[PDB]
Design a protein around this ligand. Structure first.
Ligand SMILES: COC1=C(OC)C(=O)C(C/C=C(\C)CC/C=C(\C)CC/C=C(\C)CC/C=C(\C)CC/C=C(\C)CC/C=C(\C)CC/C=C(\C)CCC=C(C)C)=C(C)C1=O
Length: 219
């Protein structure tokens, strides 16, 4: 199904390489297997209300996951956790709305978004159980995850139709977001990441649940 060389789980050099070879095929999607495309990833509609900003995103897209570099995969067979560190550049797009304020500036907006995130580092931890199925085939079954993020290099904000078309105000806001990009990544990044992470997690869990572990590991 997926092109992956078989590792011992505690050989982290190997696992980091296997994840790296699998990832692009995987994120392309596996229609017949019930695995959605994850680059470009369709994010489900969401909203958030945080630190004075009422935000929504519709027709959400996350681009970039097909080019992620896996930094390390640490498998702890004792605790039955997997730690996966990786980084990428990502673009988040869609029909956004904004009201309230961002930090010290009031905002209104109803238009299109293009967020370009450069060298975002992600720290994923998954909990899993090994589970034999009804016909006796052992599977890795994902149970929970945590994900943290750190945008190290830069984040760029493209927001159309801010301030009902007023250039002056839109220009001031856009300059403002790019100058304080880090702060803004830390204030509002979590709900965005979570929109992607829950969908990505669903599909990995679905996939691993159905593919025998012996097909993708030395167990
Ligand atoms: C070795 O055997 C194998 C396994 O073990 C058995 C495997 O598990 C697997 C797994 C299969 C593959 C390796 C695929 C693995 C997949 C992996 C590691 C991907 C995991 C991805 C995670 C679940 C989620 C990642 C999430 C992201 C990239 C999203 C990040 C986005 C972020 C942080 C957005 C940040 C946003 C901001 C900074 C600004 C936000 C602000 C605003 C929107 C508001 C702006 C202000 C207003 C005005 C608009 C394989 C292949 C295998 O072979």
């Amino acid at each position: 199904v997926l092109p992956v060389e078989k590792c011992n789980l505690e050989d982290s050099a190997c696992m980091t390489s296997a994840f790296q070879q699998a990832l692009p095929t995987f994120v392309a999607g596996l229609p017949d297997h019930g695995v959605e495309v994850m680059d470009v990833l369709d994010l489900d509609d969401f909203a958030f209300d945080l630190s004075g900003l009422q935000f929504t995103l519709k027709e959400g897209k996350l681009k970039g996951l097909k080019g992620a570099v896996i930094d390390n995969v640490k498998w702890d067979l004792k605790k039955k956790n997997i730690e996966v560190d990786f980084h990428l550049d990502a673009t988040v797009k869609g029909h956004y709305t904004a009201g309230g304020r961002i930090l010290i500036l009031p905002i209104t907006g109803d238009g299109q978004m293009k967020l370009k995130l450069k060298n975002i580092h992600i720290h994923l931890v998954v909990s899993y159980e090994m589970e034999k199925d009804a016909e006796g085939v052992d599977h890795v079954i994902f149970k929970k995850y945590t994900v943290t993020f750190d945008v190290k290099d830069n984040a760029q904000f493209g927001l159309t139709n801010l301030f009902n078309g007023n250039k002056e105000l839109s220009d001031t806001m856009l300059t403002f977001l790019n100058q304080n990009w880090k702060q803004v990544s830390e204030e509002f990044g979590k709900p965005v990441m979570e929109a992607a992470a829950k969908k990505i997690f669903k599909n990995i869990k679905h996939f691993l649940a159905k593919v025998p572990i012996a097909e993708i590991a030395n167990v």
